[PDB]
């Protein structure tokens, strides 16, 4: 199936100008789109992601959404009716702890929906460099009706 990939593998390392914001937006308007998000792991390279945090911790089952001015956590399967999560990605747990999450959008989406993931490395400090904050935005428009 058609797959969209957000890969932060190298984009969040501490830098002089940091902390910077790297935004990865995925626009989905067709059925059976697979979204793959790759966020670096603590320890993948030493000292670079010591204080990295993923949000929501329980992604992709839980996601972030911005109702007006407030950011809130919500279940994706309740945000998009009929969406299902598989607990594994290629025989590894489907969780940011393993570095990668994936979800396939359902054949029918009724209402437009925006949700976010955060791969925040801003609390890690190498020399006077500070890590960056990675933001994934998934913009789903209605399709299949």
């Amino acid at each position: 199936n058609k797959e969209y990939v957000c890969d932060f593998t190298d984009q969040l390392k501490p830098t002089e100008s940091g902390p910077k914001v790297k935004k990865c937006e995925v626009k989905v308007n067709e059925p059976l789109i697979k979204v793959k998000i790759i966020c670096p792991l603590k320890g993948s390279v030493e000292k670079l992601y010591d204080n990295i945090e993923y949000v929501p911790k329980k992604s992709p089952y839980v996601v972030l959404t911005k109702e007006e001015t407030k950011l809130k956590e919500k279940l994706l399967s309740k945000l998009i009716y009929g969406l299902l999560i598989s607990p594994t990605v290629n025989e590894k747990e489907n969780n940011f702890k393993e570095g990668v999450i994936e979800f396939t959008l359902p054949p029918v989406v009724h209402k437009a929906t925006v949700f976010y993931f955060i791969c925040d490395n801003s609390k890690t400090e190498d020399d006077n460099k500070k890590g960056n904050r990675g933001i994934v935005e998934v913009y789903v428009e209605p399709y299949g009706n």
């Epitope: 059976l32 329980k58 992604s59 299902l84 999560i85 359902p106």
Partner: single-chain antibody
Amino acid sequence: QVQLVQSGAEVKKPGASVKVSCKASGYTFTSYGISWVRQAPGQGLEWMGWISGYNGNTKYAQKLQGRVTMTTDTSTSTAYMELRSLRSDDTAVYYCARDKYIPVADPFDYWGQGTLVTVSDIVMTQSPDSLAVSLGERATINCKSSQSVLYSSNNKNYLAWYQQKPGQPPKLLIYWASTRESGVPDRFSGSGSGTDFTLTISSLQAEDVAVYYCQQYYSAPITFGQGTRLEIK
């Protein structure tokens, strides 16, 4: 009105091929998929593969890779399974079951009646192969998975329990390891987390005589326990 109607039983010489059909009705075919499960006589359940109802994409079990082909006919809501180079150990009842638009997300609630074909990885281990209990007494069945099936993102065990009575496909009793399917009596209880799970049947009745299976839908391939036949002492 979900229904899955399969083609009739066939006898085949070794080395030939067989194509089983599965006609679906009562739901939107393109929003779901079909999984195929086979059952050798008096033995357990093996997952053969999955096919999308939307685009015909397939996922096959490596065990059968090369010999099995799955196809769909969207206009007729029909799924097909062809098994090639039949061996004697391919003798089994072949079942179609409705699946979700991705495999490995939920267990099987709706099944076909099965097709008998006669030819002339997470491991699930269920403790007692056979069990005899007295009327009114509780029976306990254990299931151990070789690795944890608890998903950290939702704190749910991707573990299911089935009841198969003679002549019938397996019936889903419990999913999430403790949640009863609609209509399932409260005397059927599921418990456990991680790798160790238990099915408890209190106040055993004659209607409970059957074979019981556990199943993980945590990671492909889908795998079942070997089955626990329950008789009355």
